[PDB]
Write a protein that binds this ligand. Structure first.
Ligand SMILES: [Zn+2]
Ligand SMILES: [Zn+2]
Length: 943
């Protein structure tokens, strides 16, 4: 649709405006990179290319996914990479690395960080202790944990496919290789991290003897092992990344992994299928009174007489009348054919409200909601509730009676044969066009009460449910009382249709009726109060008196009988129950290490004020122009971009980036690897005073940094960024972003009034029509939510306003750029963009703020925060302002070792591109079955 395409284009314009500002800011060289560190993508193909490449892959992925699906496509890409279709990548090791990252990113839809943060390296090595044959090794980093077990297990299968395509042999561990792993898993689980799945020593041996690649990595934890100096294992400490992949990946997710091996047809994994099966192999009573009794056996201020909730309605696939939306995981959808609420007005009048227009008219006069309305819930879903009598059930009984009595064959919810409609019309004394419409749409086309009664009389069918009151909501003793008051004090006007005598109008004094007025309300009887009288007009006078036999038989309360049981025992016209079932800190301002110098609160301002010196592991930069050394990116003397100094951890020799690159990040006269940082003496007073001068902000209360950096780089964030955060009362996350940790609920529809946004604002946002396709002109209209449009809580809005003020201060004071947001109130953020990031994911989704709710839980479209991610059991989301993330996020701030629940936005997604049950079903709900038993019932009926 052109409306959706225009929406996606509007978002691109807004995204591009944010990237142009951030590119200008980053070009200045005050940050770890001269570029914006968050690439954007349209789709999973684009996510793959943007994250790990190779260039031109996204185009191939689209073609391959369209032909073969995601799983097979990943293998086809590995083949093409190795064949050189994406250019000469150089060494077999560079081809292996590219094919590993790309294929794993394809399989994980570019949603997780395993291809970037999880795999540090891919190496070709030899089984020197064995046959000296070549094999593939994957070097896993501790942050692999952030991607979940499924991603970890798939990296192993990808590694195996890649090594086979490169013609490499299998990894053939020595007995010392296997035992070191057994030891490592034990020591890791015991004192580092408790494994989600803790394998037995023999399970570790099984995995180790059968995984065809080496699951390895650099040391993640300073914990010495006893199986030391193993050939090919370049550490004597714990390889946490590897341990996680083996236990929490391959063994924990072994059942999910075998499904992938099956979809992909990879051989040599029978040992894993055998592991999965081994884990598996080791006085009389009334009908309704009886039904309500069995039904029980299977808020304190609330009215006991009033049943709580919506009237259950089984759907063949949630569904709510627009009038109940105005007057009152699951997603609500407007359905105009089902029933709305039953309301009592201030004047005492009782009314059914089944349309949007009537709901608006009575809204100001509603005194009580007697009945909430229907809720259409799909049977697809374990105790199953008895079905409420409804038009769907009644129409089936109506057509069964025509077949049984007259041999006329008719079907509901379809076009019928003219001759059959005519035959039945002649027997029923009705209009063929009326019958056609009632059969086609029984929820919309109801007969008048006299014809409903005539249908029951002729066909022996229960009274139509539209004319069935909530008889069983009332105790039989109260119907008995009501009966006497009507018999003695009511003035009744009668009518006669084809020999059927029925009530046309009931007039009873409010005085004479008394307490029984409450019985009429509980019955859901529509009535009016005028001139001290209760008046029951047509068709409701017959709905009341026809089940009571026009007061020709006396209603008497009987023990162990429900009201409908008494009616059904004594009345010619029979009923079914229309209402039996009812439903319903933070502690950091700047990423800057202060050690113990800022006391217990890591206060940089206190450290600088007390003239304290800090000894912290921190990265230093050398100026090539003058020679200045310090923790900043730009030179404070000549303003030229400074070069990172690499340090040898032994001789403490300093080597600038280019010199370190020549020496392959290894000291030229020590065989030990260089570090981008060292333990250094820091003088916060000179650093903070310069930062204060730069941004012209002095009056900060406190400035909370970190005790130490958890990144591999230990490259601090500029203090200027912290000063502006403290000024704006905002706090930073580990990666340089500011996040609001929210809980959101899925929605598909909204009303402007409910989100506190005007019709004109929404028209400017591109909303043209309501759910019915009618022009959007009222704040009360029900509107369909656009896929990336989100409603935040007022709590989110209150914090985000502060973030917008920090971004604007940063742009102007630190970057010398114009302000962007200019927000004073949270409503100024409507139309502005955010990044939504779910737990265990590294692909954020672009969202547009369209409104705010007074509640703690915000709203988003089901596509924005999928039920699948919500089943990876995080209803929590993190929200960042788009521009805050583009300016302030850096991969150089990512944790080196710890992989938690919350990951980073490694990429952002800019586009989110997208009859009836048989009679036997309804009858079977009365015999209290489960849906397993009932699906069998429906499947057998559909021969
Ligand atoms: Zn300089
Ligand atoms: Zn050295």
């Amino acid at each position: 649709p052109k409306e959706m395409e225009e929406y996606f284009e509007m978002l691109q314009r807004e995204i591009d405006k944010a990237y142009e500002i951030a590119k200008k800011a980053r070009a200045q060289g005050k940050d770890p990179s001269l570029d914006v560190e968050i690439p954007q993508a349209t789709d999973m193909a684009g996510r793959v290319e943007s994250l790990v490449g190779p260039p031109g892959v996204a185009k191939r992925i689209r073609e391959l996914v369209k032909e073969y699906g995601k799983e097979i496509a990943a293998l086809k890409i590995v083949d093409e990479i190795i064949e050189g279709k994406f250019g000469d990548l150089g060494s077999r090791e560079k081809y292996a690395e590219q094919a590993v990252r790309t294929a794993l990113a394809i399989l994980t839809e570019g949603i997780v960080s395993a291809p970037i943060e999880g795999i540090a390296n891919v190496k070709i090595k030899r089984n020197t202790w064995a046959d000296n044959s070549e094999y593939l090794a994957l070097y896993y980093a501790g942050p692999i944990r952030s991607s979940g077990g499924t991603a970890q297990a798939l990296s192993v299968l990808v590694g195996d496919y890649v090594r086979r395509k490169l013609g490499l042999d299998r990894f053939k561990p020595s007995e010392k290789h296997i035992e070191r792993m057994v030891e490592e898993v034990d020591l890791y689980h015991r004192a580092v991290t408790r494994l989600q799945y803790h394998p037995s020593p023999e399970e570790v041996r099984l995995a180790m003897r059968n995984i065809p690649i080496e699951i390895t990595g650099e040391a993640t934890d300073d914990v010495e092992v006893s199986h030391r100096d193993v050939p090919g294992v370049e550490t004597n400490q714990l390889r946490g990344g590897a341990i996680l992949v083996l236990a929490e990946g391959v063994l924990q997710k072994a059942k999910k992994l075998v499904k992938y091996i099956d979809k992909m047809g990879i051989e040599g994994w029978e040992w894993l299928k055998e592991f999965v099966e081994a884990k598996e192999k080791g006085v009389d009573m009334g009908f309704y009174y009886s039904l309500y009794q069995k039904f029980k056996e299977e808020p304190l201020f609330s009215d006991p007489s009033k049943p709580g909730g919506f009237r259950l309605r089984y759907g063949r696939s949630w569904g709510i009348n627009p009038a109940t939306m105005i007057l009152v995981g699951a997603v609500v959808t407007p359905v105009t054919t089902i029933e709305g609420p039953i309301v009592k007005l201030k004047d005492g009048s009782v009314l059914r409200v089944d349309d949007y227009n009537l709901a608006l008219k009575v809204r100001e006069d509603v005194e009580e909601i007697l009945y909430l309305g229907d809720a259409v819930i799909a049977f697809g879903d374990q105790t199953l509730l008895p079905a409420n009598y409804c038009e769907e059930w009644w129409i089936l009984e109506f057509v069964k009676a025509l077949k049984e009595i007259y041999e006329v064959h008719l079907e509901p919810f379809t076009e019928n044969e003219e001759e059959s409609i005519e035959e039945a019309s002649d027997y029923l004394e009705i209009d063929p066009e009326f019958l056609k419409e009632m059969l086609r749409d029984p929820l919309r086309v109801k007969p008048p009460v006299e014809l409903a009664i005539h249908f029951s009389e002729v066909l022996g069918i229960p009274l139509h449910p539209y004319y069935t009151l909530y008889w069983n909501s009332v105790e039989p003793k109260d119907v008995e009382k009501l009966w006497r008051l009507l018999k003695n004090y009511a003035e009744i006007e009668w009518s006669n249709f084809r020999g059927i005598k029925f009530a046309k109008k009931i007039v009873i004094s409010q005085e004479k009726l008394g307490d029984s007025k409450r019985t009429l309300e509980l019955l859901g009887l529509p009535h009016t109060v005028r001139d001290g009288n209760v008046i029951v007009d047509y068709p409701w006078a017959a709905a009341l008196l026809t089940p009571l036999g026009n007061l020709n038989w006396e209603f008497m309360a009987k023990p162990l009988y429900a009201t409908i049981d008494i009616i059904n025992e004594n009345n010619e016209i029979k009923l079914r129950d229309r209402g039996i079932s009812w439903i319903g800190k933070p502690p950091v301002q700047v990423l800057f290490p202060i050690g113990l110098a800022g006391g217990s609160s890591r206060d940089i301002k206190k450290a600088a004020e007390e003239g304290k010196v800090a000894e912290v592991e921190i990265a230093f930069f050398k100026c090539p122009k003058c020679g200045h050394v310090g923790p900043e990116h730009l030179c404070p003397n000549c303003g030229t971009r400074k070069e990172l100094l690499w340090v040898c951890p032994r001789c403490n020799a300093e080597y600038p980036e280019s010199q370190a690159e020549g020496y392959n990040y290894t000291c030229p006269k020590c065989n030990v690897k260089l570090r981008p940082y060292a333990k250094r003496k820091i003088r916060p007073s000179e650093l903070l005073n310069r930062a204060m001068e730069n941004v012209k902000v002095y009056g900060v209360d406190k400035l909370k940094g970190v005790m130490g950096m958890t990144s591999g780089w230990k490259m601090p964030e500029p203090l200027e960024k912290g000063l502006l955060r403290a000024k704006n009362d905002v706090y930073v996350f580990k990666d340089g972003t500011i996040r609001f940790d929210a809980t959101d609920a899925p929605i598909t529809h909204f009303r402007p009034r409910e989100i506190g946004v005007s019709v004109e604002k929404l028209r400017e946002l591109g909303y043209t029509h309501d759910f019915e396709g009618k022009p959007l002109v009222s704040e009360d209209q029900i509107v369909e939510l656009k896929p990336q449009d989100i409603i935040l809580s007022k709590e989110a809005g209150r914090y985000l306003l502060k973030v917008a003020k920090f971004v604007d201060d940063l742009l102007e004071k630190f970057y010398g750029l114009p302000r962007f947001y200019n927000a004073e109130k949270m409503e100024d953020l409507i139309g502005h963009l955010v990044i939504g990031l779910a737990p265990h994911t590294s692909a954020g989704i672009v969202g547009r703020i369209i409104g705010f709710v007074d509640a703690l839980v915000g709203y988003a479209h089901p596509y924005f925060h999928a039920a699948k991610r919500r089943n990876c059991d995080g209803d929590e989301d993190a929200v960042m302002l788009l521009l805050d993330a583009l300016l302030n996020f850096s991969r150089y701030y990512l944790p080196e070792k710890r992989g938690g629940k919350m990951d980073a936005p490694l990429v952002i997604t800019t586009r989110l591109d997208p009859r009836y049950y048989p009679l036997e079903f309804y009858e079977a709900t009365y015999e209290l079955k489960s849906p397993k038993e009932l699906v069998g019932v429906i499947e057998r009926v559909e021969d």
